[PDB]
Amino acid sequence: GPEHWHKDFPIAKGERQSPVDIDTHTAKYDPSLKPLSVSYDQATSLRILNNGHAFNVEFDDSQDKAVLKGGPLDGTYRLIQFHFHWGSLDGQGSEHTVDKKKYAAELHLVHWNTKYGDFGKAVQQPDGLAVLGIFLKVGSAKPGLQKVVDVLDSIKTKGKSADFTNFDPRGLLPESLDYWTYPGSLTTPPLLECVTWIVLKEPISVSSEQVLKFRKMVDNWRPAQPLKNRQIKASFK
Template sequence: MASALLLFAVLFLGTVDSNNLKRRKNGKDQWNECPNIEGFFSYDSNSPCGPQHWHKRYPLCGADKQSPINIDTDKTRCEDDGRVHYRHSGEVGGIFENNGRAPNFVVKKDHLRNILILGDDEDNDNGDNTGYVFKELHFHIGASGSSYGSEHTVNNQGYKGEIHMVHEKLKGGNNKKDTDDKKDKDDKNENGGQQDTLVLGRFFNVIEECCSYADKLISRYITKIPNYMDETEAHVKPSRMLPRDGKFYTYVGSSTTPVCKLDVLWTLFKTPTTVCETNFKVLMDLETWEAGNPPRSKFGNNRPIQRFDVGDVRTNFGKRCRDN
């Protein structure tokens, strides 16, 4: 009888251990080790909640066409609509917040009026779904000592950081009704320009002199939000972040933070801007939502490259476009 009970106990404990192992492998209980913050994720590569594990809590982070990517300029092709510009451009009010992930500017609802246009038609902000409204702006940088801090790379070369301006598709107006054009929208999504979310990306390098619009935003507002959950009233003019030459790369991918929203249209400007050394230190010193609130310099906030061999990146510059 005793032998039978001993055998049962061994088998039972073995089953429990096996089930626990399965849960650990698929990540179901790893997140219990992370800070108890809604929507939490980490940039710490050694954390059970780090970028390599995001898909275990946020399944879309493991889906196809993830961002960021490496742009291989030898594989790009020419973009038909070769211009990005703002209509109704002006300064908008909002809040600069330290949300623990990044210093993030959020436009107030009654200031959602800066309309980004794809293409050359100045008035085309409703008729064929090419208008996007500016909603957010935030900064990505690398950990202290990292070779680069941008999320995207070009020919396997990164920059010190990357600024993202998030836009959402205009709703209403003369846009086609969803009930009439669902199939048409699916077809257009394959060609770009019809996604619900568009992100403008601007790389930046670090120099000694403070002279860019990014420097103005950091000096005026981000210096006021050093601690996690700090916020301050702010005003931003997104058109000031666009380069004069207007050269860009564009492709369809995902958002680079959980929930890793799919079908995001990315437009990354070729020409970088700058951030001065003093203001870059401000970005590095910001508190994060990681356990103990260490500075951003400890882990950075740039997601690792998700795709290297991407064949559907388009540009509005270069020999291919001149030859067309």
């Protein structure tokens, strides 16, 4: 596991690895950051599948039917999938941290830069993927989330999948798209340094009834990585 990733994947000791802690004092507000555009009105989900590390909802990236522009990014990024990381106890579970503070879970909406013509060729570049990072606090319910948790048992174990259509990812957004952003990597192997992270300040809510159905596979995240030379910029003053 994570301590012995550097064996098979030596990018793991790299100068741009993710996730990172976000000490808010140093995270200086950049006003050249345009604001965050999200066109998901024609997002076409295909499958939900437990891959024996987490569960991924797959999307149709055949054309610009669900795209991410603005923020720090040059061009159009296509939604390809989203998946979660989550813990055992609930004061642990998120990949990223804020002043060392940790959420129950983190939701990662993954997009790839159409400059490069598919995910395969995108993952090979520094500006290849843009990953939209959203925290989960446990609290008020999430109707957006409810359509997911429902079907979690028709994929109990590693390898099982399902049809999963007309899922609307905009149900997973918070009311504030204020964000920190830094250059980083996949949090899981192959840990490729091909990612412009977009971590949102505002978490969403999920009910206790929702986090328990997500286990009935725990602590499936990765420790804070060294920030090295990198600046974290912030969209909010």
